[PDB]
């Protein structure tokens, strides 16, 4: 189930999956049917994947709790209305379906996807094992990044793969891509936040579907930290007090070094750590942000 | 197989489909395998891509050469491996149409590990044959400017206003497109279409050039649309469709314009005329 550092804010649930169920380990709901993830197949005529005509969001489940399911459905449905996608289901129906996908999977730790496409409009929901852009150890102890020399954004998951390969060839774990106008764009599968003089900044691109950075901004807010979506300059990145990766697939990752240069002392920054540890604490704290899945 | 108007330039091949083939009526090719259309499914996890749309009419596939050139050119951008060559995709494409037994077919090539999907299904109409011949009604939406979100909203406003279709403007008050088509206007024996996955428009411009009609890709203003002599829709799914009225007011004499009719009748004749553009399909 992936090992996590002992005594760390990151711990998997302790429990037994009954694999006699064909649903164990991954459930996808397609066309009114809950089916094992392995057998979940979508028509080639779905003009969503065929012609990028879809809305989607990604959620997560941790310790049997699904995080901010309501906010995810509002965001998915908002997107549905802008694209004139009528799912045919209500918010409550989509909620019960998402929760049943997780329940039938038996996963206490799960990566969840909700998609609405133009098929007659189609809804696809899946719950599969929890996904890491960075392993648990790196979430705790921090990772290493470079700015690619051989790929920029404009001011394409191909760029992101190349950026990642170049990082690994230069002996770092990940890339922070810049754009044409020398502003921070993003990482392969994450957004970047910088901390400078107790303020937090993240690019305005908002490519990622998830709600993790919104949670980071709200956590920063409740910590008295000014947090802003805006253009982040090359200068701001290389002069940042802290840099962090933010994504649904692993949460908040300290970035210890950029182009082999330590950021602060070359260890996770104090604001990165406070936000990260709060994020994981939220997964066990009764309140509006979580619902327990019934297994 | 969809009725067409009697005596019109639009007539389906006359033939019976052998449904003893599981491939009859529509076929998909997915990474090595030919499948009945209905069986053409991919993993949800598999669900960055380029694609082109083409058509077959009277057993002839239209401009597959130029479609494949367009498709591969697109593949190098987005860093997507072709996996196969042009001659190979060409064979696979003609084989899908052949196996489908469809003389009239809508065909799609997509490149998205690399995945290549090809299919041939029954021919798709943006506008029914009756409107391809007798023309249709349009409005400029007041609540949507220039995403199938916009074009679906345009379409909803058009129907709400009693019209068959919408012609969207951009924030610059220039003509963008309709839902599923490019707009061409005729003014003073000149053809114009807005400077914005089908070779149907390029085909209209080459037909227009060959009739001694200037044709320009440029900015068309709202005022040029309302003042046009003729308005037509252009798309792979149905070809060239006259627009007889705009905001309830007839364009011209309230019937298909003569350039529209000339270009339209020439496009349908291209399918039946042997040459570089059309290749007969071995069924």
Author numbering:
A (entry chain A): 19 to 137, 151 to 186, 198 to 337
B (entry chain B): 19 to 65, 71 to 135, 151 to 184, 198 to 247, 251 to 337
Task: List passages from the publication reporting this PDB structure.
In this study, we focus on the ω-transaminase from Mycobacterium vanbaalenii (MvTA) which exhibits activity toward d-fructose rather than fructose 6-phosphate. The transaminase MvTA demonstrates transaminate activity toward d-fructose 1, and the resulting 2-amino-2-deoxy-mannitol (ADM) 2 undergoes dehydrogenation under the enzyme GutB1 and spontaneously cyclizes to produce the valuable azasugar mannojirimycin (MJ), which serves as a precursor for 1-DNJ. The dimeric enzyme exhibited the characteristic structural architecture of class IV PLP-dependent enzymes, consisting of two subunits. The interface between the two subunits constituted the binding pocket for the amino donor and acceptor.
A mutant M9 with significantly enhanced activity and thermostability has been successfully obtained and crystallized for structural resolution. The obtained mutant M9, incorporating nine mutation sites, exhibited a remarkable 16.4-fold increase in specific activity and an impressive 208-fold improvement in thermostability compared to WT. In all three structures, the asymmetric unit comprised two polypeptide chains forming a homodimer. Moreover, the mutation of K142P notably heightened the rigidity of the loop region (137–146). In both the first and second half-reactions, the RMSF values for the loop region (102–108) and its adjacent α-helices in M9 were notably lower compared to WT. These findings indicated that the proline substitution at position 105 could enhance the rigidity of the loop region, consequently reducing the flexibility of its neighboring α-helices.
